[PDB]
């Protein structure tokens, strides 16, 4: 009742990079039991000798598999439009992503798409 | 009755790149339960630092596995002829592909072919 | 009775590349349920930007796994001799390959060989 | 949606150096993911002792790889005609080059040309 | 009762690399049956000829999969903060890691994170 | 079907510089996926200060890699005879080269030769 | 009774490359149901354009997994000694290999070794 | 937490060599994981016989790759303006460069520029 | 009773490479059913044309997975100390390894370590 | 069977330049898959302005990599003796070279030598 | 345990060429697996005809890549100060270099410097 | 067993050019799989017009990479002493070099040295 590891709402606000047409927020449903993966830290460390690391700038990757909404063209899930993802988990965790961009669009069978979203920062409510 | 994830008709119009002989449209049947994958967006983004991406021009890939029609030579499914694919799913989604070209022909056992179609754009009816 | 996906006769005519000794045609039996794969088109397209492709010349690959005939030395199935393969499927499809050459000979346990045949063209009866 | 590193329009206006026939502007497409390189400064400094430099006059080099337009002869991309390049990037950056001249024409396979353009100045919109 | 191969307490003390805010120690729970892997030796040998090796300096890698604590932001598990890990196994083995740094942050579904910790030395109680 | 970047026919007419024996036209096949490079402009510009160039007379270089025809001696591909190359691409582009001369003959393994052809002008059909 | 695909006798004659001590022939037993793979042809063809191949000289590889004989040191199965393998299958096929050399010795658990034997020629009785 | 090899702030103060318009300081972001290289010593020794060297006066080179700020024209990164670079690394190292001058401007794709800065001296905080 | 393929005693004598503290011999237990792999030959042959090989000097690799002894620090199993391994199998085979060195230390969960030992020679009792 | 790009026999007749001792013909084997390169034309053209060339006298270079025959001293492959090379390819092409001279002897590991042969003319059978 | 190819201690004593301030000895750590290269001989021979050489005086070059110590300014590693390097390898080899001078200072990213040290002589302990 | 391309013994006899102290012969081990290159001919031909060559006197270069013997100072491998190299390969080839001289000493990491030996003649046993 308090210890449920799962997503509850995926509110995505699409905006076309060219026409700047804001479509959203539109709730989405997961296609399977796999949960969206996150990476909040924007600095990717690398391994060096004797415990040293190289703090290099990187992105806040977010892999969000969702069922494509029939009202939304499939192109918007594959880099053709910016995504403003707002995922709230069952345990209260809410992470708002703003001005994301699908970097590596992979083939989708028309219903279940998988986004590899990239943004400068990923917020977190942390209940 | 409204929530069926599957293809209904695959109307492909083959035209030989050399002789310009238009053969089609010819309905095709799926060889298994795997559905055709799509990628409508023609711009493939790439991951860069701190949320930036590089909008690079690319193609609208479409992987369409179909049962080869006995009336059509197998060469037409392996780059020897342009394909005009018109796939209509069970939920009303219809995506017309025009002037495609099989880029990476793989070996087919004579019945089940798998096309990796490449076109400048993939339309979508989006019911 | 008309919709059987399988091979019926594999008539291979071996000729030694050096001695020019034509041995064949000799019917062959499949070692398992895997069917011979084909690629009739001799031009392998490659993916480029926004729907363009590069028509490059290539070969008509044919992967034919057969049970090695005890009357034929195993070397003939591994590039030591040209193969003239003539495969007729159960649905009437007959594809004649002439002057092939096994390009990548892999190890065979003495009974089941797998040829990766390469020829300039693969004909097709197409019933 | 605002942080896309890529070109959007490449409007080139060719004019033959001899006949003074102005052909253009004609939008061009990039052949790959490599972006056009620029050098706005027309004074190339050189390294000297203890922090001093020699301000020497030079050109505003611009390396612009584009897909050759079928309506335009390939000679115009290889020094035979002046180019008036007008590149607008995805982030609003627009740089107008006037009266350029391809200085080092390299071999092109007929589709993808690479110009090494030289002009006295390269403007910049700088959004 | 003495021969139990498993972890008992994972006391991690996070400190932000930027703000130097020390949060911890906070006990953590394993997400599955996989145990944390260790490598105490900071010199990674390499294979050479006839039994010789090249003693090269390296790090004391420690792969620690833990359930992310809801009180701690997920960024701290992905390189955004130094980790002071103190793992005590069931058989008395206690290994204190100080001033570690997650080098390769991978995507986590919000509950189960996997750290690839790097430190100059890994102590060991060795009961 | 219209956007194929590749060569279709390479009709070369060899004539011996000494005996004036015209052998050709003889169609040739490409040895790999690399396409013939061209340079139609016969004036090679050079970079000077502040946007100026030096229009200097040069040649219309054409690098044409072809499979040597067994009926033709290999010497004819290495400067021993004038070449009249007539390459027609898949997109309709046809460029006729007359009275060329291989300037830098490089070693060929007996099958795949690479000509560095030099002529005063390279025509272009430009469909 | 005539159609048994399996090995019957593996008579290997080891001779040390240094001391020239000929130990053998010693019959060997297979460790599992996997049969020795062979490749009699000493010329490995490679795929080229439009049906052409490059006849390149190679070896007659033979992968022979056998149970190591307790009377023979394990080093002899891992390149330390030449092997004269003489395998006779159940269907009468007998292939004599002379002056072989294990090229890639892999780790063996002390009982089941796997040799990757290389020889200039592999004979065949071919009943 | 103390052993991070990376840059934190790159405060560059541009001033136009002609108009003397001081623009800055403006923080910059690295385009990749490559760190700015430095050379503090202004005397470049040269190798001579038997351990002797020739102390010759030189510059304090600094190669600083940064993401070009959209508010700043690209010319300022390519010698058109003096740069006052102030780089502070993650380990406390801060090196102030004053009155630098980009000596060898190379082509930049509009976002990621690479400066080869030359100054009489490079200071160092050395924590 | 005579045909048991398994290890009986693994007597390892650790000596620290730095302090030269000889700890051992200490019997070890296998963590699973996988047996230690060996390679006695110190010359690794490589495949060449038509049956020739290149005798190149190499090491006598030995992969020994053992349960780490609680009295021994885990670092000694990961290159921090030389190992003198003495494995006696159930069938009488005893192979003494002297002055080994773990070359590629991999992560161990604290109980089951896997050594990739390298030594100039591996002896063998060969009952 | 007719389209094999490879060498079959390399009959080289060595004669010492000093002692005039004719040793040969001795068949040679290729050390790898690289084929001998040829250049039959003895006149090397050079590029000039507007399609003109300078017919300059040169040699008929032939790069022939062969496995050194143990009966022949290695010096004969490195300029110490004249070579009379007679290479016959698999497709019938036979090119006889007479009174050649290795001009640039490079280091050979004792087995695989590479000759850069120079002769006034290279004949060709041209089947 | 005796056959470890690697460095153990790099004791460098810096002294400023101008102020004569002796800072050191300060132990240094290698930044990667590359070992310091040496050249003890101070006479560099040159190749002449028929086995003769020209004994010419030169230096004892030593390329020593080390991690720059935070207590030492980076200028001292780039010719601004004399270095007294004392490297002791793992196998007992200790080579003392006195009054060296970095001749060719290259750019360092602030942590890993590479010195090209030049001295009249390089001693060697040679255990 | 007879076709092993590799070295077996490298007996080098060092003698100091100054003190005339003969140290050797001392067997050496190869550091990797690269074999010593040789050039027996002492006359280096050069390419001239129409098949003529210029017989010019040169040296018998021998590149011998060996593991430096700990009993021998590293200077002896870098021109400080004459080398009397005696390499015997696995196939019986033995080449004695007398009064050699390392001409171009390159940096060695203390274990693996590479000599560029020059002598008036290189003998050969030629089994």
Residue numbers in the entry:
A (entry chain I), B (entry chain I), C (entry chain I), D (entry chain I), E (entry chain I), F (entry chain I), ...: 3 to 129
Paper passage:
The contractile tail of Agrobacterium tumefaciens bacteriophage Milano is flexible and bent to varying degrees, which sets it apart from other contractile tail-like systems. In this mechanism, contraction of an external sheath powers the motion of an inner tube through the membrane.
The structure of the tube in the contracted tail has long been assumed to be similar or identical to that in the extended tail. However, the tube and the contracted sheath have different helical symmetries. Notably, the tube straightens after contraction, suggesting that it becomes rigid and suitable for cell-membrane piercing.
